[PDB]
């Protein structure tokens, strides 16, 4: 329903593209992208699904398997067929009088919802990773940098999230 795109990436001298992969529910997802890597340049992000690597289905592979496919891949370019963060949702909240939208977080994850808040009214969910805040990616940031973005934001606060 939401369409796959092809990425084409060049290996470093060790064969790497700057990518960590994770097996979830017999798919393969991007777990970590290395700063200023080819992965990064082609816009891969934590939570994107890899449907194929060099045309081969990723279905049922482990992370260890996925990584070894990358390592063994012939030539210097690697093609991947990518489905953009299929689990992603966006919630728009409004800060109240105290400057808060209404949730507790830790390690970039929503851990509780404060009663009577914009977050409560919007059905914001716990056990969910925060991906971006007002168009700022928060993946790989300390909670302090996340809190700074939150405080500096205007009243309307749009966050993207996905189930952890």
């Amino acid at each position: 329903a939401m369409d796959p795109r092809e990425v084409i990436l060049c290996k470093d001298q060790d064969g790497k593209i700057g990518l960590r992969l994770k097996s979830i529910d017999n798919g393969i997802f991007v777990q970590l992208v290395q700063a200023n890597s080819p992965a990064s340049l082609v816009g891969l992000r934590f939570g994107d699904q890899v449907l194929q690597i060099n045309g081969e289905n990723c279905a049922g592979w482990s992370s260890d398997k996925a990584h070894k496919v990358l390592k063994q891949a012939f030539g210097e370019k690697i093609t991947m067929t990518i489905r953009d963060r299929p689990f992603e949702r966006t919630i728009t909240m409004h800060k109240d009088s105290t400057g808060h939208v209404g949730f507790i977080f830790k390690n970039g994850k929503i851990t509780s919802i404060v009663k009577d808040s914009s977050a409560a009214r919007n059905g914001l969910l716990t056990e969910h990773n925060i991906c971006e805040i007002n168009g700022q990616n928060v993946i790989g940031l300390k909670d302090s940098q996340i809190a700074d973005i939150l405080s500096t934001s205007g009243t309307v606060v749009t966050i993207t999230i996905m189930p952890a």
Partner: peptide, 4 residues
């Protein structure tokens, strides 16, 4: 820990 951190309140949003």
């Amino acid at each position: 820990e951190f309140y949003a």
